Amino acid sequence: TKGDLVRAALRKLGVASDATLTDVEPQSMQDAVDDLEAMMAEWYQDGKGIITGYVFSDDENPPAEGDDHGLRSSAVSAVFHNLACRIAPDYALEATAKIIATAKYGKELLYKQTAISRAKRAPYPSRMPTGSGNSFPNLNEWHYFP
Amino acid sequence: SAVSAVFHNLACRIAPDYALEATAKIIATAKYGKELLYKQTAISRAKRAPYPSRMPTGSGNSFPNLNEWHYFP
Amino acid sequence: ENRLESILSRFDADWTASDEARREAKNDLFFSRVSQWDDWLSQYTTLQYRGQFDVVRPVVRKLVSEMRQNPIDVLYRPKDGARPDAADVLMGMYRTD
Amino acid sequence: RGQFDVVRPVVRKLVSEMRQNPIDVLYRPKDGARPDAADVLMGMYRTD
Amino acid sequence: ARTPKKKPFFWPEQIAGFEHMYDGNDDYPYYLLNRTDENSGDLPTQPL
Amino acid sequence: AYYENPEVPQANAYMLEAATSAVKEVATLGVDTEAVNGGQVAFDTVNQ
Amino acid sequence: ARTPKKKPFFWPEQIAGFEHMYDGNDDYPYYLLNRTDENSGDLPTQPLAYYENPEVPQANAYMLEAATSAVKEVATLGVDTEAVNGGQVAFDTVNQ
Amino acid sequence: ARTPKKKPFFWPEQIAGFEHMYDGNDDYPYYLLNRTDENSGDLPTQPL
Numbered sequence A: 001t002k003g004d005l006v007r008a009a010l011r012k013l014g015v016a017s018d019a020t021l022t023d024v025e026p027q028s029m030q031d032a033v034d035d036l037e038a039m040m041a042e043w044y045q046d047g048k049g050i051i052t053g054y055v056f057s058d059d060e061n062p063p064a065e066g067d068d069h070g071l072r073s074s075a076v077s078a079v080f081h082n083l084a085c086r087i088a089p090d091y092a093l094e095a096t097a098k099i100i101a102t103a104k105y106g107k108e109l110l111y112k113q114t115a116i117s118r119a120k121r122a123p124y125p126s127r128m129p130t131g132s133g134n135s136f137p138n139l140n141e142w143h144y145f146p
Numbered sequence B: 001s002a003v004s005a006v007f008h009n010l011a012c013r014i015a016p017d018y019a020l021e022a023t024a025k026i027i028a029t030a031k032y033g034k035e036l037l038y039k040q041t042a043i044s045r046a047k048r049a050p051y052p053s054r055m056p057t058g059s060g061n062s063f064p065n066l067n068e069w070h071y072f073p
Numbered sequence C: 001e002n003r004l005e006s007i008l009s010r011f012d013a014d015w016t017a018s019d020e021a022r023r024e025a026k027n028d029l030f031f032s033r034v035s036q037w038d039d040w041l042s043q044y045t046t047l048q049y050r051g052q053f054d055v056v057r058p059v060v061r062k063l064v065s066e067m068r069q070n071p072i073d074v075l076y077r078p079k080d081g082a083r084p085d086a087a088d089v090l091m092g093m094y095r096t097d
Numbered sequence D: 001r002g003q004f005d006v007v008r009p010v011v012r013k014l015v016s017e018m019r020q021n022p023i024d025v026l027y028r029p030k031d032g033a034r035p036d037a038a039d040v041l042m043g044m045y046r047t048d
Numbered sequence E, H: 001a002r003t004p005k006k007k008p009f010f011w012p013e014q015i016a017g018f019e020h021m022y023d024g025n026d027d028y029p030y031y032l033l034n035r036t037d038e039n040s041g042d043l044p045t046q047p048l
Numbered sequence F: 001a002y003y004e005n006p007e008v009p010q011a012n013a014y015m016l017e018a019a020t021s022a023v024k025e026v027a028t029l030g031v032d033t034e035a036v037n038g039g040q041v042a043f044d045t046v047n048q
Numbered sequence G: 001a002r003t004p005k006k007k008p009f010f011w012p013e014q015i016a017g018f019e020h021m022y023d024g025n026d027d028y029p030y031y032l033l034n035r036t037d038e039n040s041g042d043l044p045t046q047p048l049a050y051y052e053n054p055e056v057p058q059a060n061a062y063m064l065e066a067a068t069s070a071v072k073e074v075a076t077l078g079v080d081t082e083a084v085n086g087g088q089v090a091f092d093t094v095n096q
Helices: A008-019 A032-040 A076-090 A097-110 A112-117 B006-011 B024-037 B039-045 C006-016 C018-036 C056-069 C086-094 D007-019 D037-045 F010-027 F041-045 G058-075 G089-095
Strands: none
Touching: A008 A032, A008 A076, A032 A076, A076 A097, A097 A112, B006 B024, B024 B039, C006 C018, C018 C056, C056 F010, D007 F010, D007 F041, D007 G058, D007 G089
């Protein structure tokens, strides 16, 4: 347990750490949970793209802290680095070199299995005979499947 | 031997917790720590795929046995 | 016969001869496509280009021409020690009809 | 599965060469034997 | 037999959302790559 | 700047070389003449 | 059939509104690219980069030479008389 | 014979999570590599 954090509030305070946390907490942390919805609807848009397993809130009363984040355990290490980069100019600061490095690295490893699964060639598009080295020439000029 | 690799990578993440940040030595050791952890992993996984499903086994052998091996994924 | 009850002897002998009429016969008409009709097999009517080449049709027409120009027909020849006019008997009735 | 079979024109040629070579029953007379024995022995054997 | 074969070098980052255009389909006159990404934009490295 | 056109893949071209070679093997019958026999004897002898 | 073939590379923001210049109607004798973009003006990113045709390994070509030559050896039986009774004397002798 | 056959050079960080692409099978439209790494990473060194 604790490979995936229990709540989005626990994930929020991890970003607050990476921000300043001198016994202060930014006022853009309140919009950090809102930014989870915006980050995942920008990339992972329309339920497709970079798979994260994220589930969206109603966006009325919940700011994604009234409903579940729905993040995978693997998706934790991606999101809170990219989240820290996004809320930094919102608070009128800019993320450091370690945060932007891991943000790109976690975004990539989140998409790695998705890119591999989408890295499979189409089955014989346009045309393809079976030859006479295989019995029964039969149907030919296969559009994909036949 | 992998308990003194990891905490260098973790060091730079928890470095801002009072607005401090890792020194050039720490990120050097951290990047070397990530390199070591996957060092023994990458060699073990490395091994070429079986012969094609169009490939003969030849008749230069006495007994040809199996033929038309996997190449699918 | 093969079997008693003649209708069974025909139909059971047909079963063993089904090897030719199923699989081999299917592949036999595919020769005749590439030769007589169109190069592609199981083609569709398209609005896009469909090619042909066929070095095969000039080769087939050349080979067919050799056996036609040198036809092999009934000629007959006498049996062992038989009379020389023996062949002309059966050829007399052959050439009329 | 491709095909070429450069094997086949060479096989066809070799089959044709052996078939145009005549290996068939003739015989020849043996030591001290009449040469007129050859046609008589082939007389019945060629009929069948 | 056993070696990897000719494929373009890319990253998931520079092929995102256009990796579907690569599969050998003949329904595309052109292929596309990302020009920008979050944080710093997409790097021009490995364009072909 | 100018548009680089498909020159036809070398893969497609190399496959076309093996395509044209596949057909012409079996076309030859061992024939070397303009008439029957001449290494095509196998086809002519089974006819007679 | 499958495997990506030569479809020249472009990027979305340099072919924006110029992906209607491949409609085959030829109301143009040219193509164009986008000069600038919002936020900062930006010239096309690698506009001279295009897909290059599949080469096929030199291993495939070198192995094909060994494939054709392997069959070519045994296709010849030797020649001692042209056509009939060349290398095939060894076949014909045991037949008789 | 005894000297190993030629192979492409790679590095562990850039081939991490994409070793499946370089497994020796060819059915993949493209290759994938790591663009960046954590701890102020770098571009993948010479996959060519």
